[PDB]
Amino acid sequence: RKAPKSDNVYLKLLVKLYRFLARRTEAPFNKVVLRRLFMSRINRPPVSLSRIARNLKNGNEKKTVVVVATVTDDNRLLQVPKMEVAALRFTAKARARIEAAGGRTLTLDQLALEKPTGANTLLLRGPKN
Amino acid sequence: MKVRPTVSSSRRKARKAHFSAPSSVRRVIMSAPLSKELREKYNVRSIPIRKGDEVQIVRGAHKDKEGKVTSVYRLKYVIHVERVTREKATGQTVPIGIHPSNVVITKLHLDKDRENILARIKAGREQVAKAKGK
Amino acid sequence: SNVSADLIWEVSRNYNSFLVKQRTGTFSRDALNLTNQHSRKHAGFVNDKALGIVPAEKGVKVIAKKVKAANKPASSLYTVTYKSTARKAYKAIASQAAKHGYRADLRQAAVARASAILRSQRPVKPEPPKKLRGAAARR
Amino acid sequence: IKQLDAVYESKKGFFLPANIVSQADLSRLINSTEIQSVLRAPKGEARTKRAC
Amino acid sequence: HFRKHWQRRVRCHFDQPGKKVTRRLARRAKAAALAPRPVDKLRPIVRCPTVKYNRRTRLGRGFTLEELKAAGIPRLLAPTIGIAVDHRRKNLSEESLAANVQRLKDYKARLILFPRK
Amino acid sequence: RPTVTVFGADGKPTGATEVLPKVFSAPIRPDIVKHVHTGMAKNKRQPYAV
RNA sequence: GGGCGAGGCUCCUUCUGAGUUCCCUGGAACGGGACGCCACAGAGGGUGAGAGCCCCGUAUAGUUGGAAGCCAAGCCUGUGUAAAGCUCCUUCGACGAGUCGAGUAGUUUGGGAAUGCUGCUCAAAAUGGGAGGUAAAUUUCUUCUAAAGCUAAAUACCGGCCAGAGACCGAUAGCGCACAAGUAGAGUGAUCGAAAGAUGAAAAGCACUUUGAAAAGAGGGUUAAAUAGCACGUGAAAUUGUUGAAAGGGAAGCGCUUGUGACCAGACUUGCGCCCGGCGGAUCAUCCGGUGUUCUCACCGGUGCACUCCGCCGGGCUCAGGCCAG
RNA sequence: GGGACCGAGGACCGCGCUCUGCAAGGAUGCUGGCGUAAUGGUCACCAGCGACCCGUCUUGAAACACGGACCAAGGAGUCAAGGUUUUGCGCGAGUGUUUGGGUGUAAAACCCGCACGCGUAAGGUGAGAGCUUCGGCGCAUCAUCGACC
RNA sequence: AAACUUUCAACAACGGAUCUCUUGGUUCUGGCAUCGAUGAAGAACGCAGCGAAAUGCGAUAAGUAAUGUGAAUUGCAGAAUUCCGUGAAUCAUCGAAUCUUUGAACG
């Protein structure tokens, strides 16, 4: 879609930022992120901390977690590993538990400034069903 | 703005009460300002108009015409002042109605009842002037 | 931070108190707008760096934003009045808008606005008499 | 002004919201040396010459 | 479920802020008649009946005759000093007796009683 | 933290300075404001019927 | 325990701010321009047009006078071996009948342990009776006292005495009724039930003359307006009359394209530059001081004094200028 | 060689060639009359050619049938309750202040106690978006193999 | 050529749309509780200097007493009011009265 259905002015700035990055850079990461920004909310399901903790269990540590959705909290996870997560939104419990474990929280414009190619990024989605 | 719940700011209720007023309420409505000389004498701004009063017209086409009040026509909310008249077709002199808000009282018909009216208004003006001062 | 020139444009693109539009075009009443067109380029109030030229008694009055004093509207405008030859007014305005990278894209519009103001302060020529025309109007 | 931070702390079930962007200045974000060093060279200009 | 004439029996509560003002002025009125006294009587602390609400506790109707006597409050004086009395309720355990005796004692410590005329 | 200047009754600053509250850093969302203002303006309304 | 009772609270009542300042338009400022002033009052209305200060009111506290309920500081008296609360106990402790209940019929309820009610037939009890819990071993246990009675509040409200409001309607709308509307009118009757607001600021609602039997008409007059004549604000369309232009050998009306006739909107009226002269002036370049700013750009004051800068006039030249064409 | 219709774009860039520039990524040069109803436009009429009277209903379609004297004003998928799909928003294992209470500049706005409604209390291979230190890591999910209640 | 029929314009008619107004309606909220045998609600007949209706009143009849305000009513006529006053008024308030025939209607 040419125009996002959202009326968020900050989402419009993110679409403009990632339109320039998808046009001028040959990285297919930027094209995927731009596509997911255009999708609706039911097509952007939440991703809990326990699901991304599954995906850093192997050698995927020290890689930036990128989720084009809002990251929730799981009460079933007793310990949260140190991790660097970039997302559209974070809940208060998810942001507090990541920062208590020693990690850091980024927005998608901070990810663009830090990793414009999406280098060493572990990209995730939530459960569709 | 208004504060008290007994007051109303309704336009139709205000217009109904004005045009359906009794003649006693119509007397208070037909009040005219006092002149500058009379204002510094009695400390009174305005008084209800009277049949023996002497007025000067300061608004209308008959501006600066001075004469004695001859009638207070409370039905049409007008006063009749002497020599401020127009002629009908038949050469008959009929008086022109002037609202009391367009005239200024330059002399008063004074009886015992008017003197209480000047006294009661004067008492409240210096009451608050002393209240504002000290 | 939360606010920027890009964000203010998104809030005020559709409706603005300076905005006037009717069919043929969309204009702007902003004093910081030069060419009086509604766009991000000429939106003086939106942009951090902007220029605006208003007429004086004899000459032009050029105002510019100071970026450090953006939250102090009583001292946010750097005002210079050019009451001299038109050539020196144009040169100083061009230097004001292009030498130090303060809106070099607006240099042409700034010089063109100073010309149009000073073209309005010349004495006006009397209009030629209207000619009655045709059989009906002449007779 | 001194009391404004206390009245937003006392709102129960509400915290001041976190924005989905960190820097709203898109000019500094695009023209930064991080983005531009990564960028591939332009294919064209703003307006292109008519060929045939 | 509109088989009856619901259009002639439908209540809209547009007087919701008006009745709130009426209720607050009724509370203000009884604070003017009883100026230093509270506008409410003291009420006992009871346990909710059923097994769903055993763990929770609430205010009951009035104090029992036995817990009123153990606290030192006479029967015929308690309604005169703002204490509700329930002749139907029974203590049936020492736990309900001890909590209400302590509640009546705390009311006595905070009470100012004026010497008749 | 940024600070703001306090001005006296004469219009001149008095030298007192206080920190800017954190609510001034909240996001500016005209979509949320218009959605709330539409519902807020309806809550004053008074019924009419035939 | 009784009787007086200052005073107080409600509610009606009198009184309480500031421009009719100067110009112009206007029949009339309440319009515009300038100068003010009041504001716990910039709600509303009236006044010859949109008025905080012309007038009534409006805000806040006081301040006059009055009505009726209730409270009440205090002041007089009380009284009789009079009433009252608790305590203890080798003394007592009365509690509602054609009513419960059983059978039956009808009705009702989510409710045959009949959910309630009513009629008929029969008709009770006293460690009793009623309703429940329970397989738990026998009706164990739980909780209340029916057939007499009173009692404020929280609840309802298309009516009564008022009051305040609306993102409601604006004379075919809104109640049937903005008007001498449940009227006029219709029906034997029960009942049915309309249509109908607006001159003007002020009637100043045509004096007088003239024609006509009169109704009316024409002069003249009132008004800012008779293009506001009580067949009255503005005054559409259907339909009609007069005048002006035109068309028409058994339909008109419509589409494309010229022509004739009538009537029109634009466009143009000169601008820019350069070169010679002649006037009027030094905001010419540079440099020096302050100020600002984008920190190298400007402004202001001086220096600048006249091959430099800016206006005006008089000539000449270039370029660009409208419509139709070769 | 003789005609007809058209001139689209608007600094340079390109592909080429008959070379002091060319006909090569779209028209310039010279000249005349007029500078106003002259071109142009709007009505009225004549002339050449074209052209059933609308709507509804039936049917494969017509035809029949019905409504249509004219004008002005009025005139018909609305509100509520309960379900359901999608889009936007807030918070998110939670969410819902507005029954009520507390303030108020008083039917607004602001704040909130206890309950309550709805929900909540483990991979491989073919792959597979994406990342890569280019050795491999591999989201969601499908085919299948799975593990458990 | 006129007339007639049709089209357009102007002015004049017919008619009452549009626009502007509104002492009306509609809906919501708030304070309070008050008809009658001491004769109600309703029905009738009378009463003004000049009134038919609407309104008010009841043979004391568009009204009397009392209280308050303080100089009118008004379409016309006539008195007024001595105006330094028990005091005008189609005034307001309202605690005293008058109150025809009926109607629950009661010789």
UniProtKB/TrEMBL annotation, chain A:
Keywords: Ribonucleoprotein, Ribosomal protein. One of its GO terms (molecular function) is RNA binding. GO terms for cellular component: cytosolic large ribosomal subunit. The keyword Ribosomal protein applies. It comes from the Eukaryota. One of its GO terms (biological process) is translation. Residues 1-129 form the Large ribosomal subunit protein uL15/eL18 domain. The keyword Translocase does not apply. Belongs to the eukaryotic ribosomal protein eL18 family. This is Ribosomal protein L18-like protein. It comes from Chaetomium thermophilum (strain DSM 1495 / CBS 144.50 / IMI 039719). The lineage of its organism: Eukaryota, Fungi, Dikarya, Ascomycota, Pezizomycotina. The chain holds residues 44 to 172 of 213 of the full protein.
Automatic annotation (TrEMBL), chain C:
One of its GO terms (molecular function) is structural constituent of ribosome. Residues 7-120 form the Ribosomal eL28/Mak16 domain. Residues 119-139 are annotated as: Disordered. It holds the Pfam family Ribosomal_L28e. GO terms for cellular component: ribonucleoprotein complex; ribosome. GO terms for biological process: translation. Keywords: Ribonucleoprotein, Ribosomal protein. It comes from the Eukaryota. Belongs to the eukaryotic ribosomal protein eL28 family. This is Putative 60S ribosomal protein. The lineage of its organism: Eukaryota, Fungi, Dikarya, Ascomycota, Pezizomycotina.
TrEMBL record, chain E:
Signal peptide: none annotated. GO terms for biological process: translation. Keywords: Ribonucleoprotein, Ribosomal protein. The keyword Ribonucleoprotein applies. The keyword Ligase does not apply. One of its GO terms (molecular function) is RNA binding. GO terms for cellular component: cytosolic large ribosomal subunit. Belongs to the eukaryotic ribosomal protein eL13 family. This is 60S ribosomal protein L13. The lineage of its organism: Eukaryota, Fungi, Dikarya, Ascomycota, Pezizomycotina.
From TrEMBL, chain F:
It comes from the Eukaryota. The lineage of its organism: Eukaryota, Fungi, Dikarya, Ascomycota, Pezizomycotina. Belongs to the universal ribosomal protein uL4 family. This is 60S ribosomal protein L4-like protein.
